[PDB]
Design a binder for these strands. Structure first.
Lengths: 772, 51, 276, 103, 54
RNA sequence: GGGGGGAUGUCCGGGUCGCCCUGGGCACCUCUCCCGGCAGCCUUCGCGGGCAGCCGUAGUCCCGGUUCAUACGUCGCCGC
């Protein structure tokens, strides 16, 4: 396997501005009550500065990025709030969980509600006021009548109503006397008391029902530099009533809950504290500032209401603009996103006892596609598609010619304001198709010269697009969940080839058996939208796969009498244990006319399907999940994609690279250890003591150890039915591995993206706080 | 510059520059190698800038 | 220590004697027990032991290994007879190589202790409450508060009087004061030499510093001027206790050596003075 | 004349010695930046191998983690390079062949 | 964008314009986005950006 | 770095011509002991000594790819 490393693809990093979990905390249940909280959909939403709202799944420590919904040009996302109803109960004792709706602001006067089922924005609401800078959903004490409270630039606390699928500007509670008071952060102490921070050195405490004002907490000047007005960037409320507030001086103030006066000033940071987080039981405070510093506070033993900084550490490479916590189903994490696009997951209850985990800033979809017969590599971001041609092999080069080797060939700009959700290219590179959430555009290429093939019948956008290897079928995923397909007719002439794309012929997906309370509760019909669309190597068979684990396949029935029919064996293809992270057919054909559909899920479940037979292959009867190698079972990185060889399949995650010889069979991280949702247990350097020993027998020969705590019959048949695997970690920030031509030999383009200070924005320093 | 030779930090003082300020320190070094009253310090600064 | 044997409080001595090179044992003596030179053995611990301190009374004693720390509470209350002088010991590993420690008692009983361990990497770890964490097999998660300002090893850490402030001193010639009620820190920065030892007065007023250039200054608080200054000969010494920042393999490891003779003249016109 | 030739010839000899070291290590496969052609580069600078030790605060010396060594090697790659993996590497014996773009 | 209005001198005839934002997202106000930055960099200056470059 | 060996790839006299070898050039893997450093555990008050040692190189599950900087007491104008 020959590899072209490629760092010239300048993929843009974007600053994370808003991190918001679905549930802030789940109720603790036992192991005999483990089946109650199995269908609870906990999702993490992260909104970046380019308007990308992208849902994560914690996956009990898996952290799989599911959906990315991009906003347009000149569109950002500043705040994110989930609104989760309480648990409704049916007539029979079954549980309908809370429907969770996602709301956002975009530095405008408009609160947007997002439709995660259709993967676009659902509603907009706006009143006559200034730009909204902070907002939150009123907590539960009413039941069906919950309301959003939003602060803004010119002062007026507007109040929006959300009930029965509605989002409308209800009224305005109050506004400040001074027009120069800007509302920058908001947090609710109880059902009726809203604590807002302002720009004129105040923390006001309004009362939502009558709209009145309980008390105006104040803070002094900043005596570190100029600019006398302190700015309270983040307020939050402890469960016992106190208010924690990080401000412009880098302080963290603890305000009394009954009297609304301050009880403590903790000088923690050098530059200003930008975001706070409070543990669900009220035991830990995490503060993230502009000095890329994260500080952890626990209460001082003895006196009550007195906090103190346990320890601080610089986890990020730029400022920590947003963070949010979660504590439930055996997982207490706090996810902090900053301006270096890397969400960092810290363990909350084991903080100082387990390592953190930096999730990848590159998207989960590889976003790198190649026409290997034309040797075109291709990548897309905000509205442009960049296509490189490579002009030569690798065997030729075995350094003055390596600069001339690559060539920045084409840059296709998409009209409008929408953003390229996905793309695909034919194997000879003459057909390109790019999907926005408004339109699906198709371009024809001539070795360049680019023309736009007129699409008809579409106009509602899509999220995934695939083009057949014989360049006859164009299959997309309209509105996430509705898979459509269209024949393209290629008519040669005296000038060349030209393409006419037919009217999209929608193919229907199988009605799966899902109970009514599961379909009502949770996020709804969110996990129906198809994540992968995979054709076979000869395009006689389609398959799609969604986030719920469902794989639906289709066959081609020919005579233009070619038409797609559902596989009779489609219902035998089961729901996977998790979402399929990769799914593609084997390009090497079989001997029975059948295909070999390789699927890897997010739980490292490598398996291969015979879909026309409707069953697993005999190789995957033999090699189960406990037979996979340990450096593939313990990776903690989601397998971003595969590239094929003859008998070998090469896998690539974000950091790892694997090959498995799929012909042969197979024969450090702890497996029995139960940790939190971020990293393994620490080993060498920790604040927390590891070996605590007690001593009876004063001669000291007798010590103790004080722990610190708060198919055996199947395999006979499967072996009566009767290595080469390799891994590396030396290609660290892989955004995409794509094959090129020009056990067979294969060239490949590995495209990395290491983040530099030239990519991240400019750090800002006054006279006093310069770094070392 | 004598204080930055005595405190071991002249390499640290010169190592973080950009193009225009390297040209500025080179211009000072060229202008002031001529005086033998600080020829030693000026030549040392020019050593570190060449390296 | 001054402990109560029957009803007569008297001195008990707690020695730390080696038995091998990296092991040692702590052994208690009365005066009449020292006269017969038999001692009540209390603990033998086996990781290069440094030092031993105890709280007021004789209730809790704190022994220090290189990486570990051994807290010991006396088993019975009121100490009826001498033969039942037994200490229950719990050992736990401090994250850095222990240079010093100061214990303050939280009180006429002994409710708790607060340990400040100044480690050789520069940090000061404050373990807030220990007897209520190791009094209770199973213990809860204990986690020290880290205070890192010194670059080299911190030579002396002491609590100050009421317990609001944590005063400290290292190689950087600066007496530092951790405010510890806020997050702030205030310091007396430019002394002559390294702050090698500090003590606090019986009242809260005075500090007394043993500065590394053979000196002692009794400072008064918030006047911060030396109300008593005593200086010695300050020449080159082959030290007995070697160094507090020669433990962690720095770039230049400090060696006790004399390379050249001391440069000194007795001065005529005043032969009692010696310039050196 | 001997002074001028002394300076020029001593600098070229020292560069040739250190470049011989770096080319021997790059033939081993430690993947450093070496000059290809037969003229002298502008800055007579060779990339040394990464030391096994790290200087922590305040002045102490600890062992370099192989993780940090890999980070610095990822810095030491260029923007385009051909990194051929052999079947002997997939068996586990030999090392790769790297040819990188001349910066 | 929007066609600019045409004034006869007394009245102003203008095309209505809401065709910019169908279902996608509302476009961020650049005056408000630069205000929140100006509260973040009050008097402080940037460090020099890159390496050796004009 | 040397002293040395087993094995990789190679041209010039070459050999019945093949296993390669001797003569010259050699680059690498492995073994071996001395060189420079680092730790442990016994001995002695220390000085030193003894025992079985690892490192002198390469890319990681996550991850130390971190932690670390020196005060107040009072400011302004003009003169020698």
């Amino acid at each position: 396997m020959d590899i072209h490393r490629c760092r010239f693809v300048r993929y843009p990093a974007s600053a994370i501005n808003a991190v918001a979990f679905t549930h802030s905390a789940l109720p603790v249940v036992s192991s005999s009550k483990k089946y109650l909280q199995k269908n609870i959909q906990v999702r993490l939403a992260i909104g970046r500065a380019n308007g990308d709202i992208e849902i994560w799944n914690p996956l009990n420590g898996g952290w799989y990025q599911e959906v990315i919904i991009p906003g347009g040009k000149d569109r950002s996302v500043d705040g994110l709030v989930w609104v989760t109803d309480p648990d409704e109960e049916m007539a029979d004792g079954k549980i309908i969980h809370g429907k969770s709706r996602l709301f956002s602001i975009g530095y405008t006067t408009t609160i947007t509600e997002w439709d995660l089922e259709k993967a676009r924005a659902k509603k907009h609401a706006s009143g006559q006021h200034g730009e909204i800078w902070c907002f939150g959903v009123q907590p539960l004490p009413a039941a069906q009548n919950r309301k959003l409270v939003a602060g803004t630039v010119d002062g007026n606390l507007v109040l929006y109503s959300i009930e029965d699928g509605d989002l409308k500007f209800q009224k305005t509670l109050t506004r400040t006397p001074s027009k120069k008071t800007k509302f920058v952060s908001i947090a609710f102490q109880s059902h009726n008391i809203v604590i807002v921070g302002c720009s004129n050195s105040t923390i006001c405490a309004y009362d939502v029902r009558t709209g009145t004002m309980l008390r105006q907490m104040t803070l002094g000047t900043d005596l570190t530099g100029g600019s006398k007005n302190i700015i309270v960037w983040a307020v939050k409320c402890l469960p016992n009533g106190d208010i924690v507030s990080g401000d412009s001086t880098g302080q963290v103030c603890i305000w009394d809950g009954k009297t609304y006066t301050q009880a403590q000033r903790i000088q923690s940071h050098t530059q200003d504290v930008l975001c706070l987080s409070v543990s669900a039981d009220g035991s830990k405070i995490i503060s993230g500032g502009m000095d890329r510093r994260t500080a952890v506070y626990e209460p001082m033993a003895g006196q009550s209401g007195r906090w103190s900084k346990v320890f601080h550490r610089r986890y990020h490479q730029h400022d920590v603009k947003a963070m949010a916590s979660f504590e439930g189903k055996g997982m207490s994490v706090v996810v902090s996103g900053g301006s270096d696009a890397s969400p960092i997951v810290l363990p909350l209850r084991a903080l100082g006892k387990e390592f953190h985990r930096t999730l990848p800033h590159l998207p989960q979809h590889p976003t790198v596609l190649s026409a290997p017969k034309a040797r075109y590599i291709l990548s897309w971001w905000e509205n442009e598609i960049r296509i490189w041609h490579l002009l030569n092999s690798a065997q030729q080069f075995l350094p003055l010619n390596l600069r001339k080797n690559r060539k920045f060939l084409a840059q296709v700009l998409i009209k409008g304001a929408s953003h390229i959700t996905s793309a695909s290219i034919s194997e000879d590179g003459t057909l390109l198709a790019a999907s926005t959430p408004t339109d699906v555009k198709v371009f024809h290429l001539d070795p360049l010269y680019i023309k736009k093939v007129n699409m008809t019948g579409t106009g509602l956008g899509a999220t995934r697009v695939q083009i057949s290897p014989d360049k006859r079928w164009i299959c997309w995923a309209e509105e996430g969940s509705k898979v459509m397909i269209s024949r393209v007719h290629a008519t040669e002439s005296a000038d060349g080839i030209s393409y006419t794309v037919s009217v999209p012929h929608k193919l229907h997906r199988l009605r799966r058996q899902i109970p009514k309370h599961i379909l009502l509760g949770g996020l709804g019909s969110y996990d129906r939208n198809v994540s992968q669309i995979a054709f076979s190597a000869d395009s006689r068979m389609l398959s799609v796969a969604d986030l719920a684990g469902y794989i639906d396949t289709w066959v081609l029935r020919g005579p233009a009498g070619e038409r797609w029919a559902r596989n009779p064996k489609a219902a035998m293809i089961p729901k996977l244990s998790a979402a399929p992270v990769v799914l593609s057919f084997s390009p090497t054909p079989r001997d029975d006319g059948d295909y070999d559909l390789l699927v890897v899920t997010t739980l490292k479940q490598l398996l291969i399907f015979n879909p026309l037979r409707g069953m697993l292959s005999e190789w995957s009867r033999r090699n189960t999940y406990p037979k996979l190698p340990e450096p593939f079972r313990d990776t903690r990185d989601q397998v971003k994609g595969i590239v094929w060889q003859g008998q070998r399949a090469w896998f690539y995650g974000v950091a790892s690279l694997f090959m498995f010889d799929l012909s042969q069979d197979f024969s450090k991280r702890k497996r029995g250890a139960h940790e939190s949702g971020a990293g393994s247990k620490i080993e060498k350097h920790s604040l927390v003591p590891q070996r605590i020993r007690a001593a009876s027998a004063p001669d000291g020969t007798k010590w103790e150890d004080i722990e610190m705590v708060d198919g055996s019959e199947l395999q006979r048949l499967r072996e009566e039915n009767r290595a080469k695997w390799w891994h590396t970690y030396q290609f660290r920030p892989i955004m995409g591995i794509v094959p090129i031509e020009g056990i067979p030999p294969l060239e490949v383009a590995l495209i990395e993206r290491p983040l530099s200070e030239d990519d991240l924005p400019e750090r800002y320093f006054a006279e006093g706080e310069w770094e070392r | 510059l004598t204080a930055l030779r005595h405190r071991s930090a002249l390499r640290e003082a010169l190592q973080g520059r950009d193009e225009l300020s390297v040209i500025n320190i080179l211009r000072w070094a060229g202008k002031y190698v001529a005086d033998p009253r600080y020829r030693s310090i000026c030549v040392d600064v020019a050593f570190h800038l060449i390296d | 220590d001054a402990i109560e044997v029957a009803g007569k409080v008297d001195d008990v001595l707690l020695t730390l004697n080696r038995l091998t090179k990296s092991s040692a044992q702590i052994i208690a003596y009365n005066s009449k027990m020292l006269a017969t030179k038999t001692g009540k053995l209390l603990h033998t611990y086996d990781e290069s032991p440094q030092s031993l301190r105890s709280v007021a009374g004789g209730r809790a004693i704190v022994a220090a290994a290189k990486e570990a720390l051994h807290i010991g509470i006396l088993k019975t209350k009121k100490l009826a007879s001498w033969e039942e002088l037994a200490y229950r010991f719990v050992s736990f590993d401090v994250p850095d190589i222990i240079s010093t420690f100061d214990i303050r008692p939280i009180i006429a009983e002994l409710q708790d202790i607060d340990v400040a361990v100044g480690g050789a990497r520069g940090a000061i770890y404050v373990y807030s409450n220990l007897l209520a964490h190791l009094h209770t097999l199973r213990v809860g998660t204990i986690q020290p508060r880290k205070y890192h300002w010194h670059r080299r090893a911190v030579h002396s850490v002491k609590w100050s009087g009421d317990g609001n402030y944590l005063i400290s001193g290292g190689y950087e010639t600066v007496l530092v004061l951790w405010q510890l009620d806020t997050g702030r820190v205030d310091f007396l920065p430019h002394l002559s030499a390294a702050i090698e030892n500090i003590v606090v007065s019986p009242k809260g007023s005075a500090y007394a510093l043993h500065l590394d250039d053979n000196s002692a200054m009794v400072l008064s608080t918030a006047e911060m001027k030396p109300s008593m200054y005593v200086s010695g000969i300050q020449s080159l010494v082959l030290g007995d206790r070697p160094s507090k920042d020669a433990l962690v393999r720095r770039v230049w490891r400090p060696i006790d050596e004399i390379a050249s003779p001391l440069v000194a003249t007795i001065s005529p016109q005043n032969p009692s003075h010696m310039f050196l | 004349e001997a002074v001028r030739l002394k300076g020029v010839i001593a600098e070229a000899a020292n560069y040739a010695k250190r470049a011989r070291r770096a080319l021997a290590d790059s033939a081993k496969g430690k993947a450093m930046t070496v000059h290809m052609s037969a003229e002298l580069p502008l800055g007579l600078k060779t990339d040394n191998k990464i030391s096994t030790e790290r200087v922590r605060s305040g002045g102490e010396i600890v062992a370099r983690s192989s993780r940090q060594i890999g980070h610095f090697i990822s810095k030491r790659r260029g923007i385009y390079s051909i990194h051929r993996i052999s079947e002997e590497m997939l068996l586990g014996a030999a090392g790769p062949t790297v040819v990188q773009e001349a910066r | 964008k929007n066609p600019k209005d045409k004034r006869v001198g007394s009245t102003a005839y203008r095309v209505v314009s809401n065709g910019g934002d169908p279902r996608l997202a509302p476009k961020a106000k650049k005056q408000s986005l630069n205000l929140k930055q100006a509260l973040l960099r009050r008097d402080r200056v940037a460090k020099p950006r890159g390496g050796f470059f004009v």
